[PDB]
RNA sequence: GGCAUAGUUC
DNA sequence: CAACGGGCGGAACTATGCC
DNA sequence: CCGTTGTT
């Protein structure tokens, strides 16, 4: 059945218990932004990393 | 702009301290080490 | 601070 | 015909050893 | 792999 409206969904859905895994790759360890931060020494360009 | 005899190096330019910066314990670059060796041999 | 090596994502 | 020299992907993220 | 330069 549909969640918002309560009406049956016309097509029957394939549902059952499958074994899932949570991989190491999260988003809190990947989000990154910069606006005028630290700067390299030899080239005076922005740092790397 | 390019006279033929000038291609024989008799005066060696030394790059400024910006081209070969010091390292922060103070470390000298590969260019600085080679320059020191060259001037050692030259004065000897 | 830098050099090198290894692993991983697309 | 033989010898020599330069050329060989793009990004990104961790870790560890050493000067 | 294949553009230069030497040797022959």
UniProtKB/Swiss-Prot annotation, chain A:
It is found in: Nucleus. The modification N6-methyllysine is found at residue 24. Catalytic core component of RNA polymerase II (Pol II), a DNA-dependent RNA polymerase which synthesizes mRNA precursors and many functional non-coding RNAs using the four ribonucleoside triphosphates as substrates. Pol II-mediated transcription cycle proceeds through transcription initiation, transcription elongation and transcription termination stages. RNA-dependent RNA polymerase that catalyzes the extension of a non-coding RNA (ncRNA) at the 3'-end using the four ribonucleoside triphosphates as substrates. An internal ncRNA sequence near the 3'-end serves as a template in a single-round Pol II-mediated RNA polymerization reaction. May decrease the stability of ncRNAs that repress Pol II-mediated gene transcription. Component of the RNA polymerase II (Pol II) core complex consisting of 12 subunits: a ten-subunit catalytic core composed of POLR2A/RPB1, POLR2B/RPB2, POLR2C/RPB3, POLR2I/RPB9, POLR2J/RPB11, POLR2E/RPABC1, POLR2F/RPABC2, POLR2H/RPABC3, POLR2K/RPABC4 and POLR2L/RPABC5 and a mobile stalk composed of two subunits POLR2D/RPB4 and POLR2G/RPB7, protruding from the core and functioning primarily in transcription initiation. Part of Pol II(G) complex, in which Pol II core associates with an additional subunit POLR2M; unlike conventional Pol II, Pol II(G) functions as a transcriptional repressor. Belongs to the RNA polymerase beta chain family. This is DNA-directed RNA polymerase II subunit RPB2. It comes from Bos taurus. The lineage of its organism: Eukaryota, Metazoa, Chordata, Craniata, Vertebrata.
From Swiss-Prot, chain B:
The tandem heptapeptide repeats in the C-terminal domain (CTD) can be highly phosphorylated. The phosphorylation activates Pol II. Phosphorylation occurs mainly at residues 'Ser-2' and 'Ser-5' of the heptapeptide repeat and is mediated, at least, by CDK7 and CDK9. POLR2A associated with DNA is specifically phosphorylated at 'Ser-5' of the CTD by CDK7, promoting transcription initiation by triggering dissociation from DNA. Phosphorylated at 'Ser-2', Ser-5' and 'Ser-7' of the CTD by CDK9 (P-TEFb complex), promoting transcription elongation. Among tandem heptapeptide repeats of the C-terminal domain (CTD) some do not match the Y-S-P-T-S-P-S consensus, the seventh serine residue 'Ser-7' being replaced by a lysine. 'Lys-7' in these non-consensus heptapeptide repeats can be alternatively acetylated, methylated and dimethylated. EP300 is one of the enzyme able to acetylate 'Lys-7'. Acetylation at 'Lys-7' of non-consensus heptapeptide repeats is associated with 'Ser-2' phosphorylation and active transcription. Regulates initiation or early elongation steps of transcription specially for inducible genes. It is found in: Nucleus; Cytoplasm; Chromosome. Belongs to the RNA polymerase beta' chain family. Component of the RNA polymerase II (Pol II) core complex consisting of 12 subunits: a ten-subunit catalytic core composed of POLR2A/RPB1, POLR2B/RPB2, POLR2C/RPB3, POLR2I/RPB9, POLR2J/RPB11, POLR2E/RPABC1, POLR2F/RPABC2, POLR2H/RPABC3, POLR2K/RPABC4 and POLR2L/RPABC5 and a mobile stalk composed of two subunits POLR2D/RPB4 and POLR2G/RPB7, protruding from the core and functioning primarily in transcription initiation. Part of Pol II(G) complex, in which Pol II core associates with an additional subunit POLR2M; unlike conventional Pol II, Pol II(G) functions as a transcriptional repressor. The C-terminal domain (CTD) serves as a platform for assembly of factors that regulate transcription initiation, elongation, termination and mRNA processing. The trigger loop allows entry of NTPs into the active site, switching between an open and closed state with each NTP addition cycle. Catalytic core component of RNA polymerase II (Pol II), a DNA-dependent RNA polymerase which synthesizes mRNA precursors and many functional non-coding RNAs using the four ribonucleoside triphosphates as substrates. Pol II-mediated transcription cycle proceeds through transcription initiation, transcription elongation and transcription termination stages. This is DNA-directed RNA polymerase II subunit RPB1.
């Amino acid at each position: 059945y549909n969640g918002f409206t309560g009406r049956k969904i016309t097509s029957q859905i394939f549902i059952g218990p499958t074994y899932y895994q949570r991989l190491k790759h999260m988003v809190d360890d990947k989000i990154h932004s910069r606006a005028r931060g630290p700067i390299q020494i030899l080239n005076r360009q922005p740092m790397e990393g | 702009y390019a006279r033929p005899e000038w291609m024989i190096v008799t005066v060696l330019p030394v790059p400024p301290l910006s081209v070969r910066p010091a390292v922060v314990a103070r470390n000298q670059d590969d260019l600085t080490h080679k320059l020191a060796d060259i001037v050692k041999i030259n004065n000897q």
